[PDB]
A paper describes a structure:
Two PGL proteins, PGL-1 and PGL-3, are key scaffolding proteins required for proper P granule assembly. PGL proteins can self-assemble into granules, both in vitro using purified recombinant protein9,11,12 and in intestinal nematode cells or mammalian cells in culture when expressed on their own. These in vitro PGL granules display liquid droplet behavior, indicating that PGL protein alone is sufficient to recapitulate the biophysical properties of P granules in nematode cells. Assays for granule assembly in mammalian cells implicated the conserved N-terminal region of PGL as critical, and structural studies identified a central dimerization domain (DD) within that conserved region.
We determined the [name] PGL-1 NtDD crystal structure to 1.5 Å. The NtDD has a novel fold consisting of 11 alpha helices and a single N-terminal beta strand. The asymmetric unit (ASU) was composed of four NtDD domains, which were structurally similar (RMSD 0.219–0.254, C-alpha chains B-D aligned to C-alpha A) except amino acid G114, and the first three N-terminal residues could not be visualized in all of the copies of the ASU. While each ASU possessed two pairs of identical interfaces, one of these interface pairs consisted of a network of conserved amino acid side chains making extensive salt bridges and hydrogen bonds. The complexity and conservation of these interactions suggested biological relevance. Recombinant PGL-1 and PGL-3 NtDD each dimerized on a sizing column combined with multi-angle light scattering (SEC-MALS). PGL-1 and PGL-3 NtDD interface mutants formed monomers rather than dimers in solution. We conclude that the dimers observed in the crystal structure represent the NtDD dimer detected in solution. Therefore, PGL proteins possess two dimerization domains. Based on insights from the NtDD structure, we designed two distinct PGL-1 mutant proteins that are unable to dimerize in vitro and are severely compromised in vivo for assembly into P granules and fertility.
Numbering used by the authors:
A (entry chain C): 1 to 113, 115 to 215
B (entry chain A): 4 to 215
């Protein structure tokens, strides 16, 4: 969107900040994901349980940055790249370089530009952001806490805060793509999954059925 | 017996309903003659620098004639205030047993504290993922109980602001001494969040918090 603001969007029961084009894809293509998942998008097929083939980095980047993406789409998807960790940081820097010609930049560019000191400054920034009363500030706080997490369990704990903004879909997608479900987190992942399924059961039962079954 | 947030004329609270009522009922006193006001209220609202006693706090949390819901809510407050209030918590819980009532976190007051806290940690993490205020309050309470140091306690109590329970976070900060060089900027945000609401109903009382 032609805005710099972090905004939650929704598509037919799927509320999302980090993955709007994935949500839209799934809403449009649910019958294809049921009936011929190998011809469907591999990121969507994996997330929704239609395929056990993990998407590539390229598959993910393509969904995050479709052709004709505007500045708000790019900046939002750059947040997603940061949350996705080191395999996506070179892509983040590329997208940030592209924006500079337009006098645009990612607001957390201090990371990519003494990372320890940036992360401590960001830690304080995120703690104050969370105390603000807006969704945009709370998303920023969760992003910072996720970036500053060192191990998977901490990262899962901080991403789980997305469920407090009814962003269970995003927490679920990150859990799937980053491999955060293990013996310690499994019961909590099940609650997150069930929160998302509770919304899906009302709008896209086919998608719910794939996630539950196959 | 459900955990229910309440409000008194601009003061939204879970943990301190009788403190909020006291402020509604003694507005003028706190603004105009605070040396005559209740010491816990006077301290919280910035009218006095004298810290309240344990008994002062307990009497506001458990007024004479308190019913079982009031008792159970205030026992949550005792647990959040920490080990200094555990003997009071156990006494209140023992008295409830005759009526077939108990606090739902009674395992804390029994054997093996460490094992109970590990079990409560997992329950709190699942509770926070539920979509109700009652479950989210339980999760914050557990996370506070399981915090050892002031900074961690402050971080977990700050989550009350996500339920617009800034008043409660502010009261706990005042009573537990959580404001220091590391937390002062965040305490100011929490205070201002509460005052932004209090300004709409009792601006002269909000002014005492700002200015003494």
């Amino acid at each position: 969107m032609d805005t710099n603001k972090r905004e939650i969007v929704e598509f037919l029961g799927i509320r999302t900040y980090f993955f709007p084009n994935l949500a839209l894809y799934a809403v449009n293509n649910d019958e294809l994901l049921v009936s011929d998942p190998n011809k469907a998008n591999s990121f969507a097929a994996y997330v929704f349980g239609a395929s056990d083939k993990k998407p590539s980095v390229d598959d993910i980047v393509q969904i995050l940055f479709p052709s004709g993406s505007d500045s708000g789409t790019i900046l939002t998807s750059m947040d997603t790249l940061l949350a996705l960790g080191p395999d996506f940081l070179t892509e983040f820097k590329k997208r940030n370089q592209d924006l500079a010609r337009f006098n645009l930049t990612h607001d957390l560019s201090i990371l990519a530009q003494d990372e320890d000191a940036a992360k401590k400054k960001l830690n304080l920034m995120g703690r104050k952001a969370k105390l603000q009363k807006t969704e945009a500030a709370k998303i920023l706080a969760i992003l910072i806490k996720t970036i500053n997490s060192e191990e998977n369990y901490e990262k899962f704990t901080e991403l789980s805060e997305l469920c407090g903004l009814d962003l269970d879909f995003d927490a679920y997608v990150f859990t799937k793509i980053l491999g955060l479900e293990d013996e310690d987190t499994a019961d909590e992942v099940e609650v997150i999954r069930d929160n998302f399924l509770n919304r899906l059961d009302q709008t896209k039962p086919k998608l719910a059925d794939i996630i539950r079954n196959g």
